[PDB]
């Protein structure tokens, strides 16, 4: 996260770290959506241009974390993966269209002060909240700059951007399965996701019921925090039918 701040303890209890077994290192962010299911970006697991194709046994999920590098004894919980499901129409060839994946845990994780699931949006909450100017929150342990790394989980609040402005900021083809967020050059403030924040959540706090909803998944950006560029996020509600199909079939 570029130009963010240290998270407060328990501020993002759905935050998940995807951890590589060997070598031991951060792979991506992710989020907890139930006691057995974790949501992430497809490109965290499958990205052929970079020779990335992880299998279940390659990875661990670490839940309840705050410190990036420490083993947080008595606080974090580490889970093995039963199965990975990647969207069948994930487009890694062009623009990361439908950049979404689910991971089922081998055993249910116990909830605690530090571990708790985020809500997924219904059509109505999505329609109400996914509006230009409305701010969401992005969290992760990714790099602090495009070109170092944080001691603890970072957080940044960013405004959703008008679709034509998103489109005009890039030569990449944008789809309805994405939205973009970030400050414009003339707005003074800044901030973005960066390398390592991939797969983490873009959340919004509903003013209707005071619950946090995951509206997006950290997906892609041309660099990190560049003037005139924006971060692009997987549109979670647009892909919710697939999410539900997977959970209903394999749950």
């Amino acid at each position: 996260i570029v130009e963010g701040s240290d998270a407060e303890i328990g501020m993002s209890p759905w935050q998940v770290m995807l951890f590589r077994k060997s070598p031991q290192e951060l792979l991506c962010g992710a989020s907890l959506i139930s006691d057995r299911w974790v949501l992430t970006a497809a490109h965290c697991l499958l990205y052929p241009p970079w020779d990335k194709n992880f299998t279940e046994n390659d990875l661990l999920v670490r839940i309840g974390k705050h410190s990036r590098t420490r083993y947080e004894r008595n606080i974090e919980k580490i889970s093995m993966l039963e199965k990975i499901y990647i969207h069948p129409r994930y487009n890694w060839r062009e623009n990361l269209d439908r950049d979404i994946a689910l991971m089922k845990l081998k055993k249910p994780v116990a909830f605690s002060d530090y571990i708790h699931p985020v809500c997924l949006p219904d059509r109505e909450t999505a329609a109400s909240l996914l509006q230009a100017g409305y701010k969401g929150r992005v969290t992760g342990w990714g790099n602090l700059k495009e070109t170092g790394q944080p001691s603890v989980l970072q957080v940044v609040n960013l405004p959703i951007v008008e679709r034509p402005v998103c489109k005009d900021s890039t030569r990449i083809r944008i789809t309805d399965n994405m939205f973009c967020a970030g400050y414009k050059p003339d707005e003074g403030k800044r901030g973005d996701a960066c390398e390592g924040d991939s797969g983490g959540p873009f959340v919004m706090k509903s003013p209707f019921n005071n619950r946090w909803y995951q509206m997006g998944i950290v997906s892609w950006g041309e660099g990190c925090d560049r003037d005139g560029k924006y971060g692009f996020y997987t549109h979670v509600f647009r892909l919710k039918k697939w999410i539900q199909k997977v959970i209903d079939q394999f749950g």
């Binding site: 701040s5 407060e8 303890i9 328990g10 501020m11 209890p13 959506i33 139930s34 605690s112 002060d113 530090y114 708790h116 699931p117 985020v118 809500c119 997924l120 909240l129 100017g133 409305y134 701010k135 969401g136 929150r137 957080v155 609040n157 405004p159 919004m204 706090k205 509903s206 003013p207 005071n210 619950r211 946090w212 909803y213």
Partner: peptide
């Protein structure tokens, strides 16, 4: 599930985090 999105150390105790107000203020 029914308890999703309510943080034990915040919503569940009626405590606010340091920047959530920034989000609320943007929901015009």
């Amino acid at each position: 599930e029914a308890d999703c999105g309510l943080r034990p150390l915040f919503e569940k105790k009626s405590l606010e985090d340091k920047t959530e107000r920034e989000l609320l203020e943007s929901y015009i």
